[PDB]
Design a protein around this ligand. Structure first.
Ligand code: F43
Ligand code: F43
Ligand SMILES: C[C@@H](OP(=O)(O)O)[C@H](NC(=O)CCCCCCS)C(=O)O
Ligand SMILES: O=S(=O)(O)CCS
Ligand SMILES: O=S(=O)(O)CCS
Ligand SMILES: [Mg+2]
Ligand SMILES: [Mg+2]
Ligand SMILES: [Mg+2]
Ligand SMILES: [Mg+2]
Ligand SMILES: [Mg+2]
Ligand SMILES: [Mg+2]
Ligand SMILES: [Mg+2]
Ligand SMILES: [Mg+2]
Ligand SMILES: [Zn+2]
Lengths: 548, 442, 246, 548, 55
């Protein structure tokens, strides 16, 4: 059959994808593009309205001396110019981040123990349901105790709410179902039994604060906002004095002793509080993506949907804005989720390992790393040499390094069932690619690449960690594009080949199995395409409180 | 001596030990037992070998609810604890005959580790204690079982947690009384970021010892912060002596006189009468049926009022056997004594202000928690320069079981290990003995 | 002890609420069962719940301070810590928020008192709380029109009075009976209906409210005219200021 | 004439403002309110669409047993319910913070030294204008060097741009005036001469990044985004290699050596990066507010426009959401900017000081503190005693404590010309108030108040600082409502009475003297009223990229 | 050139006593040399140690 990227290449260029020559300079520059023409026109309108020059195609060098390409969003039939995948221009990408930033997981286990021991009161499915009706009024910013309170407009905060989950089916049955993330409905039977065993009789809240508040403020607001309104709803639903010594134990539990933040705080050179992208470990990003519970008979689809989630968040929004900004890093990320290119390479690797070893059957050792990562690295590089249009599409070396090494690393982990040997395969792919083509990425691309082999199996203080615990603050990874989202995919890969329900934290996996989110985490690449087409409806807008 | 003052020193049963000790013999700058406690705090680590083994066997590493399926490793660490600890000790020590200590507890489930003082004299700060301890135990476990290169990173995750993706050792199975340097609210604060429940656990809930350990740590931080330099030094030293060391048996005698039936107000009346009897205050002016008191020695007035504040805590929270009201005692002991006298309260209003915010943040939705989870580096309780937190430690020592976040809930690993160390558990004894020893060198 | 400077009736009233030798005037009689019902923590005939075992069952380690300090009775039993909370109108209620916390830590043992503008609370062991609560409810600490027992929804200290002279209550826990001139408590302090209302007696008249109040106001005694109390506040300000500097 | 608050009291209540008695319980609860009725309807629609209960007026206690009041925005004739002043429901309040968060001041002095001394190229007003045309293309997110760049849609980022200012009039007049903040046009003559003397021959950029980016990301993105696009425009406009060793000097200068953040980063318990509200010192907040250059004849109006700016940002958005959340702290802040109440009390104090001393003529000592702060505290408190409707309006003791003490501390500083004795007067006010009424604020209100007198003139490490340098991270101020925006007013007060052009940073003062900002900093209370009326048009919305 | 005594560090957790003890000794020596008043001394503190502890 055709390689999986052939249809996209045939859409981009008039030539067949094998052809070695083309003609340039005759497309009229920016005038070849619908989207650049929209931007030229809008720049002139902006600059006149405000009295300061702004977008002008004649400043600097003239874009479009070659074809400005469409991109196919992988797994879709949607083709868009790359500007429609820039996070500023894509409301689905912005919403994906807002839905992670505004979520926290908050136990009720300590809180129910303070109620039974210090207060001497009962907790039952009934009192939990009453509490959940109360906190679903309070959480978006409405009052339950004081007179003369002024409140948030419910329709500005319609995306904020609180659900619960538990491994105990007979409570999950007894609590009103509007408030419950039902594990048995959301997960196939084997994954549901794993997840229920991990949670056991614990009961956990999934709290989503309003997108408009997250956008006004920051990620470190989320667990505070959540705990204020859990605290008011525990006082209202359980009949406390409205502010007694026991009220402090609910605050400490909701803010510190039973909270799970999506990201941990950062060191001062990159100072940020909790629930910012740099604090989200790679294992959590794979568990936030919900492809694992829908596409479980296809470990390549599950792993590549995690790569798309992480390349967009960590390279476009995090490295390309929070840690830099400007035009940013759209296409360093799009290489990992367009034109079915990473998909072709990773399906080759999966077939190679299923035929040679069987998934999860290969020895977990350096012999397996050398075999699989070298075979898949040579396959992916051969495609750029056989298809000139593929090399002109992924024109930057860094884009090619990340795609070829992601396929090599994921394939290695599909063989071993262990993410650490998949990570060693990622670094070996970089070293082979650098020698094959006498180039790799941009000036700084392989800082982590050259520390990489030596730090995969180190045990020292700031070196040693399983890949699932690493993230954008692991020291070697803290600066550079074209790695972080691919590492999230390698973290997912052995767990998708094993059939595991989660990669690192089962509470995080269950917390995003929820159709009341704005973004659909079961189909991340489909959502990116809907946002690119201007068809996604985000939360957070101010239209209701601004003129027509 | 720079100061003429002398004090009499007692044991925790109210008996005189040493009379007429120059005030500077209790200074953290001079007293060698304060030096030994502070260096001990810097270099001591608790290792939970059972916890390490269970994290490995279940693959539950990297923080709450985290697990990596397929990474499980079943290692007989507690069954081979002696060999593992000896191998760690040979990497931790500098020489054969230094002051490194590695001691098994609980049948090998825990280890007390004291990293050699010498690694600190060539270090900027105190993080060598957990980081040298953690690597020596990770390497000793790998070497005991010949753990492979492919699996050894799970041992590291089980010992030190999610660090360095997290800034803290998130999920670690080692513990220290200090916390990481990045969490300081300001430079010089590290001896203040020691949870009140860890001081009460170390001292086995002995009220006077918990108050003395807390005061030695708070007032030694005042020197490191520069607060006890120049004009303020004598104030700080008299606070240490009278509020934390029971100087002159003042605290003890107030508690003895008010323990059966007294209140915060009855303690205040006795302390004002004692200050007057000693010549610390005198009537400056008569208003209408109201005496306005003055003092020619504000540092000494402050110290006597500080001893009364500690005694008032012990009477009020001791009577309830419930620590929560320490926030109230810290506020109203100071508010009442200023309208009783016309003189400024302890720390010139800063205890009262710390107590206002502490009361709010131990009875509200916004933050804080029970008394035991505060410390001198907590934003709510950093404001008084050593005169508030020791009272919170005395109150939690006196709590009979009212707290969910008790020292048994938050500090069990710290209790098992750090109460083994005699100068942590019983500091009042050692700092008194040392002050007597150097009394003629001041 | 002196307690408070000043030469007004307000000043003397502040000293009398603090002085444990001053006998608080008793204004009304309330049964033990009705104090339990108003508190709302347990039903009459329910045993005291425990938060920990009795102190005798604990056998704790030798500590000179524990041995010197007698526990209150509810602490020996292991009782829960529970509360009672009051709101005081700025229209001349007899007690006011700081006057309560200051007086409570002069009069009562083992007490956690908190002051706010619209509420004031004491938390202690349950059986001792019921003994203290009788005195707070029966004496001139309390007036049934200008003070309210309120564990939540406390608004009213700063509101205008209604046409009966009653402070506002969002939850209407205290109802003035025009036929008797007396107030009934119809709900407990957290707002649940009582099976049978509790008589709280007649509101103090205007002359007696002025005799007994501890708030300073231009239409009663103004603080600025109690020049000896302002002198001591200003002295405390200046001495704290100079102390913090040098 | 009547006290300034009388008209508002007559609008709120049917009784005369002096009347001691009223009627409660007969207003139909929430049904008395147009805004609560809009919220009940919207809660029914939100819950029906999403399948989870949300706002319900019958959960917890029933609002509106008393009158739910309108509030006059002070200095305006606009009366709104207090919900319209919640920051979630007020687009002008969100934009005010977005305009601060997304601004950074960046010198060109080191940069021009690098060009002259290291690249050996000349800098003139013409080369500065060419660089400014280039950076106003690049700063919103458009390309100047590489081929096949994908860019931000110009109309989504129309609020981003770069201007400059200098104290040398003849250099200012040579740069193209579309890019120049003209000091002589924006400031009265004496303040213009003070500011231009401070700046001298220095040349400074004021960079504003896009509001849509600041909402997606955080404050610490601002100086990075600014530096990336300064760096690209220095490459393009001065003809560097696109990435040579000297490129790193422009990065270090724009990101560290000549950058002025609006806020500095915070310690880990409240971890946040730069340009968050807690890092903004009180003297910078007074300088951001532009009332000083318009209402300089009236020091009361200038001081109380700074109090409105700070009470909204520090109590409503910072303490009420970043540091807590929920229903939050609208009316803790509205007390300082509604009903003309603080205005009445502070005009009284100004007139008192003019009569007794003359502005700025009193001795800067404790005798002045004791005289003026006591007199003004007793005036304010007498108003609540003489007018029962005024006390029912400012029903919380914290609200009254912050209003009375702000008038007392501003009036002390009008007498001494020095903010530190102003601050001692604020604390004495709280101590007198507490003894007058036997109450002050909420449970934790006077933590800083009781530490306050001793720390005014302390010189110790974490105690001693001039008030202009303190801010929300000064240790005793880090937690509590009803102080920080009033301290910004006390920091403005002596400088408005002296006729000083700025309070603490002359560059921050000039940087907000710009009618290209979206919020109008010269009339902060007017803009709050416009947002309450749903008449303010914010930047950052996604309407262009979402369904019609 | 200031070298704070070694003994202050053997009773400290870390190294901030060097700037903190130096700064306060110079701030107090300058206030004492000129008899700077309570009202003005906070400016000496600002000129020695800056915007700490707001920063
Ligand atoms: C000025 C630099 C040096 C530097 O610090 N950053 C630059 C420029 C910067 C700008 C370019 C925008 C503009 O044109 O105004 C931005 C978009 C970042 C920003 N400020 O928004 C960017 N690079 Ni660069 N940069 C990229 C890349 C690259 C590749 C391009 C090689 C090629 O053959 O075309 C090379 C590095 C390499 O050789 O490996 C590169 C270099 C360079 N990169 C050279 C300019 C190269 C030139 O003169 O043409 N980037 C890429 O390899 C692909 C992704 C692409 C980024 C935009 C996106 O992700 O959509 C962009 C990312
Ligand atoms: C539960 C607490 C304890 C605590 O930790 N926070 C509370 C409640 C919290 C809630 C109340 C929302 C709700 O009703 O659901 C919120 C809005 C914070 C949030 N979670 O969004 C709040 N307080 Ni409170 N809180 C306030 C105030 C106050 C005043 C109210 C006194 C009165 O007589 O009405 C008193 C403190 C005092 O007495 O000084 C107070 C207490 C209390 N405050 C008591 C409840 C009092 C009661 O039972 O009625 N607040 C105020 O004094 C004014 C501003 C007002 C805040 C809302 C705004 O700023 O618009 C609100 C700020
Ligand atoms: C004390 C501290 O909370 P923790 O004790 O650390 O949970 C802190 N909150 C606050 O200061 C809350 C301030 C805003 C709400 C109270 C305003 S009066 C914080 O979240 O960092
Ligand atoms: O040319 S560089 O490697 O410096 C940057 C690539 S975006
Ligand atoms: O009642 S509390 O003072 O704790 C809170 C005020 S919002
Ligand atoms: Mg051809
Ligand atoms: Mg959808
Ligand atoms: Mg006595
Ligand atoms: Mg006499
Ligand atoms: Mg009787
Ligand atoms: Mg010219
Ligand atoms: Mg007069
Ligand atoms: Mg305008
Ligand atoms: Zn944001």
């Amino acid at each position: 059959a055709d390689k999986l990227f052939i249809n996209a290449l045939k859409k981009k260029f008039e030539e067949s994808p094998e052809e070695k020559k083309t003609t340039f300079y005759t497309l009229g520059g920016w005038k070849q593009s619908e989207r650049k023409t929209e931007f030229v026109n809008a720049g002139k309108e902006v600059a006149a309205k405000r009295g300061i020059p702004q977008y002008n195609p004649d400043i600097g060098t003239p874009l479009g001396q070659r074809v400005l390409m469409p991109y196919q969003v992988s797994t879709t039939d949607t083709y868009v110019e790359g500007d429609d995948l820039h996070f500023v221009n894509n409301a689905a990408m912005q919403q994906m981040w807002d839905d992670i930033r505004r979520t926290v997981i908050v136990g009720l286990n300590h809180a129910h123990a303070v109620i039974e021991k210090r207060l001497g009161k009962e907790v039952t499915p009934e009192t939990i349901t009453h509490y959940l009706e109360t906190v679903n009024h309070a959480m978006p910013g409405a009052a339950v105790v004081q007179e003369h309170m002024v409140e948030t407009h419910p329709a500005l905060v319609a995306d904020s709410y609180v659900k619960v989950f538990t491994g105990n089916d007979e409570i999950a049955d007894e609590i009103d179902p509007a408030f419950v993330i039902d594990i048995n409905k959301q997960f196939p039977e084997d994954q549901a039994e794993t997840l229920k065993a991990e949670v056991g009789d614990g009961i956990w809240q999934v709290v989503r604060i309003p997108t408009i508040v997250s956008r006004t403020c920051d990620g470190a607001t989320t667990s505070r906002w959540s705990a204020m309104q859990i605290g008011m709803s525990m006082i209202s639903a359980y009949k406390q004095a409205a502010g007694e010594a026991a009220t402090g134990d609910f605050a400490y539990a909701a803010k510190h002793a039973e909270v799970i933040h999506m990201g941990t705080y950062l060191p001062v050179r990159r100072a940020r509080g909790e629930n910012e992208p740099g604090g989200v470990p790679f294992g959590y990003l794979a568990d936030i993506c919900q492809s694992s519970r829908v596409n479980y008979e296809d470990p390549v689809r599950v792993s590549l949907d995690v790569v798309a989630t992480g390349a967009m968040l960590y390279d476009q929004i995090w490295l390309g804005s929070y840690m830099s900004g400007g035009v940013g890093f759209t296409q360093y990320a799009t290489a990992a989720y367009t034109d079915n290119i990473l998909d072709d390479f990773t399906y080759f690797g999966k077939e190679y390992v299923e035929d040679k070893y069987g998934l999860c059957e290969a020895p977990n050792n350096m012999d397996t790393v050398l075999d699989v990562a070298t075979e898949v690295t040579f396959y992916g590089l051969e495609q750029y040499e056989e298809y000139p249009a593929l090399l002109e599409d992924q024109f930057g070396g860094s884009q090619r390094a990340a795609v070829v090494a992601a396929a090599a690393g994921c394939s290695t982990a599909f063989a071993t069932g262990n993410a650490q040997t998949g990570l060693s395969g990622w670094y070996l792919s970089m070293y082979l690619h650098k020698e094959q083509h006498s180039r790799l990425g941009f000036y700084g691309y392989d800082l982590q690449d050259q520390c990489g082999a030596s730090n995969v199996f180190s045990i020292r203080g700031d070196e040693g960690l399983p890949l699932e615990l690493r993230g954008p603050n692991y020291p070697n990874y803290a600066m550079n594009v074209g790695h972080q989202g691919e590492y999230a995919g390698i973290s997912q890969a052995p767990h998708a080949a094993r059939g595991d329900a989660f990669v690192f934290n089962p509470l995080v996996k269950i917390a995003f199995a929820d159709d009341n989110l704005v973004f659909d985490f079961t189909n991340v690449r489909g959502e990116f395409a809907k946002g690119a087409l201007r068809e996604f409806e985000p939360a957070g807008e101010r239209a209701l409180i601004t003129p027509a | 001596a720079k100061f003429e003052d002398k004090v009499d020193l007692y044991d925790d049963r109210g008996n005189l030990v040493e009379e007429q000790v120059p005030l500077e013999a209790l200074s953290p700058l001079r007293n060698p037992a304060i030096k030994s406690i502070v260096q001990g705090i810097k270099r001591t680590v608790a290792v939970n070998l059972e916890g390490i083994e269970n994290a490995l066997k279940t693959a539950k590493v990297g923080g709450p609810a985290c697990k990596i399926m397929g990474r499980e490793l079943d290692l007989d660490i507690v069954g081979n604890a002696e060999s593992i600890a000896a191998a760690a000790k040979e990497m931790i020590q500098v020489t054969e005959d230094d002051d490194t200590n590695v001691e098994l507890l609980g049948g090998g489930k825990r280890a007390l580790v004291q990293v050699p003082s010498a690694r600190f004299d060539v270090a900027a700060e105190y993080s060598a204690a957990p980081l040298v301890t953690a690597t020596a135990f990770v390497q000793a476990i790998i070497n005991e079982f010949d753990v492979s290169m492919y699996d050894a990173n799970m041992v590291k995750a089980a010992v030190l947690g999610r660090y360095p993706q997290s800034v803290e050792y998130m999920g670690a199975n080692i513990a220290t009384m200090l916390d990481i340097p990045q969490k300081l609210e300001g430079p010089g604060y590290a001896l203040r970021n020691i949870m009140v429940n860890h001081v009460v656990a170390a001292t086995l809930k002995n009220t006077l010892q918990a108050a003395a350990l807390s005061t030695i740590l708070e007032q030694t931080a005042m020197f490191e912060m520069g607060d006890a330099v120049g004009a303020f030094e004598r104030m700080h030293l008299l606070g240490l002596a009278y509020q934390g060391m029971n100087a002159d048996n003042l605290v003890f005698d107030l508690v003895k006189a008010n323990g059966k039936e007294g209140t915060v107000g009855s303690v205040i009346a006795d302390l004002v009468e004692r200050a007057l009897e000693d010549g610390v205050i005198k009537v400056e002016k008569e208003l209408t049926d109201y005496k306005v008191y003055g003092t020619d020695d504000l540092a000494m007035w402050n110290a006597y009022a500080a001893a009364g504040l500690m005694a008032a805590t012990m009477v009020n929270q001791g009577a309830a056997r419930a620590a929560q009201g320490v926030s109230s005692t810290l506020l109203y002991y100071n508010d009442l004594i200023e309208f009783e006298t016309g003189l400024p309260s302890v720390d010139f209003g800063k205890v009262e202000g710390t107590a206002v915010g502490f009361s709010f943040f131990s009875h509200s939705i916004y933050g804080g928690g029970g008394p035991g989870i505060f410390n001198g580096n907590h934003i709510v309780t950093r404001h008084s320069k050593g005169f508030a937190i020791p009272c919170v430690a005395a109150a939690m020592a006196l709590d009979a079981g009212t707290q969910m976040f008790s020292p048994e809930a938050t500090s069990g690993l710290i209790k098992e290990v750090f109460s083994q160390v005699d100068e942590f558990r019983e500091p009042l004894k050692y700092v008194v003995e040392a002050a007597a020893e150097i009394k003629n060198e001041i | 002890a002196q307690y408070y400077p000043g030469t007004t009736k307000v000043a003397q009233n502040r000293r009398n609420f603090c002085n444990p030798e001053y006998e608080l005037e008793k204004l009304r009689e309330i049964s033990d069962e009705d104090v339990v019902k108003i508190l709302g923590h347990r039903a009459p005939g329910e045993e005291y719940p425990s938060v920990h075992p009795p102190l005798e069952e604990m056998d704790e380690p030798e500590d000179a301070i524990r041995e010197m300090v007698e526990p209150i009775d509810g602490a020996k039993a292991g009782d829960r810590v529970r509360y009672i909370q009051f709101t005081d109108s700025m229209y001349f209620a007899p007690a006011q928020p700081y006057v309560r916390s200051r007086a409570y830590l002069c009069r009562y043992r083992g007490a956690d008192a908190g002051t706010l503008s619209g509420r004031q609370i004491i938390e202690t062991r349950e059986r001792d709380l019921e003994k203290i609560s009788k005195e707070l409810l029966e004496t001139e600490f309390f007036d049934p029109a200008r003070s309210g027992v309120r564990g939540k929804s406390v608004h009213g200290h700063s509101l205008r009075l209604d046409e009966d002279g009653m402070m506002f209550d969002m939850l209407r826990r205290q109802i003035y009976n025009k036929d008797t001139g007396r107030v009934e408590m119809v709900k407990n302090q957290i707002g649940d209906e009582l099976d049978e209302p509790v008589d709280l007696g007649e509101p103090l008249d205007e002359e007696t409210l002025m005799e007994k109040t501890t708030i300073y106001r231009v239409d009663g005694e103004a603080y600025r005219d109690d020049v000896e109390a302002v002198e001591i506040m200003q002295r405390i300000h200046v001495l704290r200021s100079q102390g913090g500097f040098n």
